[PDB]
Design a protein around this nucleic acid. Structure first.
Ligand code: NA
Ligand code: NA
Length: 327
DNA sequence: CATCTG
DNA sequence: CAGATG
């Protein structure tokens, strides 16, 4: 956690680059398990040789550590921090819709900067477009004050449309979190479930409404269960307009809310732990449900859940406020 | 994983 | 459809 740091770090650089610049998924995947192992490692790796001893750890990686440990640096790494192309591939990705695949292409096309991206605005797709449009807004953290505001809205309107809607703004926002990155909204309705043969309108109605009243600016993606968009806080009385925000809205049958619900909130860790425990108690939990684990190895069949309480209950555990879900 | 693009 | 993005 602090003894094998730098090492685990450089590796992560290394691991990144492979994937991003190169394509060396193998090589990438490689550093990863490494940094992952040197990670758990109880001691203070003092040499390559020492490391090598470890799994995932091989000769090439070994070699690397030695240099790093030897000298406060890595040539390979220093090389890469200079390489503009590499640079540029990292840069471009910053944009929504722009993945690395896309990254290269544009680079190779000699587009590398923001200006570059504007000039060839044609070359970008829809999402890619919004992305560039809202580069700044996007990189901006969402503070609670706005957070709670938005929440009020979304919550309100959904109400208007149907009384059976069940909105839930999960995320760190749900954990207390002083600032968020985006607005993750869980959604369900009773007339929606496991068997209940589709009903896309469910999702679609509310969407319309938000754009109706203007909460929502653009569309990233709009499927039959997951919308991906942009929103905004009605600039009160002109002088201070709001950043645009990333907003996701997902439909879910009512027969599996609370888990998604649970899950979506987190944190990752809280999950694992509770996931870990659940295992103990003789059950399983993943995003959609919690099943009774038979002894035959594994086994299942759905458990009925009317709330988060209901989950924890099963696992015979202390109902923890979303605030204390931290770990 | 769910959606999009081409 | 394979394939990219989130
Ligand atoms: Na990106
Ligand atoms: Na293939």
């Amino acid at each position: 956690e602090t003894l094998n740091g730098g090492i685990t770090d450089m590796l992560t650089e290394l691991a990144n680059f492979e994937k991003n610049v190169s394509q060396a998924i193998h090589k990438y995947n490689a550093y990863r398990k490494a940094a992952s192992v040197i990670a758990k490692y109880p001691h203070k790796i003092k040499s390559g040789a020492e490391a090598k001893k470890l799994p995932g750890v091989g000769t090439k990686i070994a070699e690397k550590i030695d240099e790093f440990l030897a000298t406060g640096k890595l040539r390979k790494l220093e090389k890469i921090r200079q390489d503009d192309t590499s640079s540029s591939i990292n840069f471009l990705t910053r944009v929504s819709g722009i993945g690395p695949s896309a990254a290269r292409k544009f680079v190779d096309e000699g587009i590398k900067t923001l200006e570059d991206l504007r000039k060839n605005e044609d070359k970008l797709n829809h999402h890619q477009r919004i992305g560039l449009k809202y580069f700044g807004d996007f990189e901006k953290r969402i503070p609670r004050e706005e957070m709670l505001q938005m929440q009020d809205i979304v919550l309100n309107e959904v109400k208007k449309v149907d009384s059976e809607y069940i909105a839930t703004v999960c995320g760190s926002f749900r954990r207390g979190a002083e600032s968020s990155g985006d607005m993750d909204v869980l959604l369900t309705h009773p007339s929606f479930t496991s068997e209940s043969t589709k009903q896309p309108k469910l999702l679609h109605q509310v969407v319309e409404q938000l754009q109706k009243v203007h909460f929502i600016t653009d569309t990233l993606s709009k499927g039959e269960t997951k919308f991906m968009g942009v929103c905004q806080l009605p600039s009160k009385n002109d002088e201070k307009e709001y950043p645009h925000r990333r907003i996701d809205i997902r439909l879910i049958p009512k027969d599996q809310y609370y888990c998604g619900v649970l899950y979506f909130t987190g944190s990752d860790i809280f999950n694992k732990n509770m996931r870990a425990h659940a295992l103990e108690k003789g059950f399983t939990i993943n995003e959609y449900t919690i099943r009774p684990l038979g002894v035959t190895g594994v086994a299942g069949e759905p458990l009925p859940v009317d709330s988060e309480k209901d989950i924890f209950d099963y696992i015979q555990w202390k109902y923890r406020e979303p605030k204390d879900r931290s770990e």
